[PDB]
Design an enzyme around this catalytic site. Structure first.
Site, PDB file in Angstrom:
ATOM      1  N   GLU A 298      34.263 -16.712  55.102  1.00  0.00           N
ATOM      2  CA  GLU A 298      33.933 -17.863  55.442  1.00  0.00           C
ATOM      3  C   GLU A 298      32.151 -17.918  55.714  1.00  0.00           C
ATOM      4  O   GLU A 298      31.529 -18.764  55.353  1.00  0.00           O
ATOM      5  CB  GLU A 298      34.532 -18.760  56.239  1.00  0.00           C
ATOM      6  CG  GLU A 298      35.999 -19.109  56.271  1.00  0.00           C
ATOM      7  CD  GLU A 298      36.267 -20.098  55.459  1.00  0.00           C
ATOM      8  OE1 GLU A 298      35.362 -20.617  54.491  1.00  0.00           O
ATOM      9  OE2 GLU A 298      37.203 -20.707  55.521  1.00  0.00           O
TER      10      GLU A 298
ATOM     11  N   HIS B 292      49.833 -27.553  43.419  1.00  0.00           N
ATOM     12  CA  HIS B 292      48.965 -28.007  42.361  1.00  0.00           C
ATOM     13  C   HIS B 292      49.357 -29.022  41.579  1.00  0.00           C
ATOM     14  O   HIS B 292      48.451 -29.927  41.157  1.00  0.00           O
ATOM     15  CB  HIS B 292      48.288 -26.591  41.803  1.00  0.00           C
ATOM     16  CG  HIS B 292      47.664 -25.611  42.871  1.00  0.00           C
ATOM     17  ND1 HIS B 292      48.358 -24.703  43.308  1.00  0.00           N
ATOM     18  CD2 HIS B 292      46.350 -25.408  43.014  1.00  0.00           C
ATOM     19  CE1 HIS B 292      47.657 -24.043  44.199  1.00  0.00           C
ATOM     20  NE2 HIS B 292      46.337 -24.352  43.859  1.00  0.00           N
TER      21      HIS B 292
HETATM   22 ZN   LIG Z   1      36.163 -20.634  49.768  1.00  0.00          ZN
END
Ligand SMILES: [Zn+2]
Ligand SMILES: *[C@@H]1O[C@H](CO)[C@@H](O[C@@H]2O[C@H](CO)[C@@H](O)[C@H](O)[C@H]2NC(C)=O)[C@H](O)[C@H]1NC(C)=O
Ligand SMILES: *[C@@H]1O[C@H](CO)[C@@H](O)[C@H](O)[C@H]1NC(C)=O
Ligand SMILES: *[C@@H]1O[C@H](CO)[C@@H](O)[C@H](O)[C@H]1NC(C)=O
Ligand SMILES: *[C@@H]1O[C@H](CO)[C@@H](O)[C@H](O)[C@H]1NC(C)=O
Ligand SMILES: *[C@@H]1O[C@H](CO)[C@@H](O)[C@H](O)[C@H]1NC(C)=O
Ligand SMILES: *[C@@H]1O[C@H](CO)[C@@H](O)[C@H](O)[C@H]1NC(C)=O
Lengths: 49, 596
Positions: free
Chosen positions: B357, B487
């Site tokens: 992140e 998905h």
């Molecule tokens: Zn990412």
């Protein structure tokens, strides 16, 4: 050393603006819309010359 | 007044308004994410509705510009992403039925409930019961029952919805001048208008087929080793040359092989490198972990970061009454605002996750000066292909010893390298054929080469060939096994993970060559390598103004997908897999099944 106070809408096209917001005719004035969470380089700065 | 001048004049105001509007929408969403309250739901919904209305109105206004009369290869790129007629070509009824189909698919997938036999009172959702059973439980009966229940009670609830979704997506692709919905997904990588660097959607299939074929020899060795290790745990469940059962793959779908590490370990007397007890001993907190990550990041020449990140974003679980999501999220609100959310706990997993992140937001801030419509990666793989590689490099023993989490008395022996490489292969190497065949099956279904009556009849050969998985119980066309995935129900492209996996290893060759690192590729550290930091930043800063081919040339100097780094990463491992597989059949047969 010039100051512009006129708010006449700029004409980006060939047809006249007719004083109505639309295609190729946008209001020349825009707001800062400052928020306390802005970045270092986007925060307000009081400039005196 | 040229048409390009008019497009630029429109786009300036469009970007200026869209930046502020998306900032408002992002802050509204972040307020709900960090504070789940009734007012935040309404605020986020109103912000999203306003943003959608503004985007639709701007697209309708900009539909009047023909794309042929814009030069400079920059304004036209924004217009392509702004027009995006999509499903709005069709009638309003077909749009609302698509919305209903997606909503029902998501609701049905979310409400997946499985009830234990002989007791219609103790039912379980996907989590925390079914997920724990699929991840840790080894009983054949319970795993088979859960697999059958999940693929039965959910497949039929979406099979007609899946048929209608496929038909209407094909209709939309036809209305948008596309061969199929697979090409609609593949259109991200398409590059046109650049001499010597043009890209086509059809070439991607051949490019991925070639790299899958070249990867293949690395995959069946691992599969044979896994089967041989499982033979010691299930002596009467796996054929010596047959495919592995579907619910003995380590989880419900077999996407990740890392769940069998506790059983398929060659050396069980050598523990892995885990320094979570070390950071517990030195009373390490979230602030200390973030400071160590910042010290790692500054060593490569990356610039400083604004104090607003520390002041605004929350980095500690509040607990008590305030309920907030704990999903690791990096919010790039724009206008110099960057936030990261974590429920940091004392575990090295969070330490490794923060490396994704922090470098992720480092990439996000790289393209600040770019137009708002171009504040993304050149493709869907460039976004954090580097953000993952810094996390992978942070696990090297050298940096772990340097930061004090590992004592210098940890002598390096080749026993640990083999275990580490096998653990990495259980997550990265194994998933590649499964992802490839899933993407190919979805592409064929969208194109229509697979007949309606044989969606599953054609589905089970790839399982027996590409991935070597055989179903434990035969199923007819009534079932819909693929529909039980995250998905497929949310209409997401599944090739993104495979492309990111391909891209992450490609950068490592250049990063280690610039860093002048010597030794195995998996022990390569980019610390104290500011030249490599500048090299990576030069590619991170381009954003979306340049095609992905040019960015790929700027790091390694190529124009096509490269798999040589993938073999280089596991080069010592493959030779050792050539050794213990000399007395076992390498591969599988497509004729035998556990149900006979
Ligand atoms: Zn990412
Ligand atoms: C990167 O360089 C820094 C400093 O140039 C290294 O930090 C020192 O490492 C030595 C041993 O490696 C320690 O004895 C010092 O206490 C560290 N801190 C200092 C000198 O302030 C760091 O180890 C290097 N990293 C790598 C991976 O080589
Ligand atoms: C979260 O929201 C509630 C009600 O909306 C409010 O009382 C509380 O102060 C908020 N949390 C913080 C940290 O401000
Ligand atoms: C493209 O437009 C930009 C204005 O944003 C301009 O500076 C640049 O020179 C243009 N490209 C070419 C090749 O003229
Ligand atoms: C959809 O948008 C595209 C993009 O310019 C346009 O060419 C096409 O005519 C539009 N179709 C409809 C039905 O509005
Ligand atoms: C800012 O970056 C410089 C490197 O140019 C580094 O020496 C300094 O420690 C950084 N500041 C903070 C607060 O991390
Ligand atoms: C490590 O190297 C030594 C000597 O090169 C060798 O005898 C030993 O078998 C190696 N370890 C493994 C697990 O092969």
């Amino acid at each position: 050393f010039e100051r512009d106070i006129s708010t006449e809408i700029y004409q980006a096209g060939n047809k006249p603006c007719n004083g109505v917001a639309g295609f190729n005719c946008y209001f020349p004035l825009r707001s800062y819309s400052f928020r306390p969470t802005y970045g270092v380089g986007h925060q307000p700065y009081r400039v005196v010359v | 007044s040229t048409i390009e001048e008019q497009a630029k004049t429109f786009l300036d105001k469009f970007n200026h308004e869209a930046e502020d509007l998306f900032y408002q929408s992002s802050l509204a969403s972040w307020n709900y994410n960090t504070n789940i309250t009734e007012e935040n739901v309404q605020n986020m919904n109103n912000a999203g509705d306003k943003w959608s209305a503004f985007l639709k109105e701007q697209s309708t206004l900009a539909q009047m510009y023909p794309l042929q009369e814009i030069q400079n290869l920059t304004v036209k790129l924004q217009l392509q992403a702004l027009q995006q007629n999509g499903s709005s070509v069709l009638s309003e009824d077909k749009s609302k039925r698509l919305n209903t189909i997606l909503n029902t698919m998501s609701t049905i997938y979310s409400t997946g409930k499985v009830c234990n036999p002989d007791n219609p009172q103790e039912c379980l959702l996907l989590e925390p019961g079914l997920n724990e059973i699929m991840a840790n439980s080894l009983d054949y009966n319970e795993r088979l029952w859960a697999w059958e229940s999940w693929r039965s009670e959910v497949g039929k609830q979406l099979r007609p919805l899946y048929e209608e979704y496929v038909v209407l997506k094909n209709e939309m692709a036809r209305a948008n001048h596309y061969e199929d919905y697979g090409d609609y997904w593949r259109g991200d990588y398409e590059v046109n208008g650049v001499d010597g660097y043009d890209y086509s959607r059809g070439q991607l299939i051949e490019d991925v087929e070639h790299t899958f074929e070249e990867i293949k020899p690395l995959y069946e060795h691992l599969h044979a080793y896994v089967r041989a290790k499982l033979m010691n745990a299930y002596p009467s469940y796996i054929s010596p040359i047959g495919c592995l059962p579907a619910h003995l793959l380590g989880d419900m779908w077999g996407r990740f092989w890392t769940n069998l590490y506790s059983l398929t370990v060659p050396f069980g007397q050598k523990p892995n490198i885990d320094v979570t007890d070390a950071m517990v001993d030195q009373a390490w907190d979230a602030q200390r972990i973030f400071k160590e990550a910042e010290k790692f990041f500054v060593s490569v020449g990356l610039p400083n970061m604004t104090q607003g990140f520390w002041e605004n974003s929350m980095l500690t679980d509040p607990g008590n009454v305030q309920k907030a999501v704990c999903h690791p999220t990096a919010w790039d609100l724009g206008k110099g605002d960057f936030r990261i959310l974590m429920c940091t706990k004392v575990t090295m997993d969070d330490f490794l996750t923060a490396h994704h992140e922090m470098g992720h937001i480092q990439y996000d801030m790289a393209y600040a000066a770019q137009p708002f419509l171009l504040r993304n990666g050149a493709n869907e793989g460039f976004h954090e292909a580097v953000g993952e590689i810094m996390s992978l490099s942070a696990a090297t023993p050298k940096h772990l010893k340097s930061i004090g989490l590992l004592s210098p008395d940890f002598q390096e022996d080749n026993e640990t390298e083999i275990n580490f490489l096998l653990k990495q292969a259980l997550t990265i190497v194994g998933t590649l054929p499964f992802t490839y065949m899933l993407e190919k099956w979805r592409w064929m279904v969208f194109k229509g080469e697979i007949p309606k009556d044989q969606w599953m009849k054609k589905w089970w050969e790839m399982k027996r060939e590409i991935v070597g998985v055989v179903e434990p119980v035969p199923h007819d066309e009534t079932y819909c096994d693929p529909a039980s995935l995250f998905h497929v129900s949310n209409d997401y492209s599944f090739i993104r993970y495979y492309t990111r996996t391909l891209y992450q290893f490609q950068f490592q060759e250049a990063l280690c060559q610039a860093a002048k690192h010597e030794g195995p590729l998996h022990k390569c550290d980019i610390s104290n390598s500011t030249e490599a930091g500048q090299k990576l930043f030069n590619m991170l800063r381009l954003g979306k103004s340049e095609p992905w081919t040019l960015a790929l040339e700027n790091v390694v100097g190529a124009k096509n997908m490269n798999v040589r780094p993938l073999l280089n990463y596991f080069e010592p491992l493959f030779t050792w897999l050539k050794d213990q597989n000399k007395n076992s059949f390498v591969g599988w047969s497509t004729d035998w099944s556990p149900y006979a």
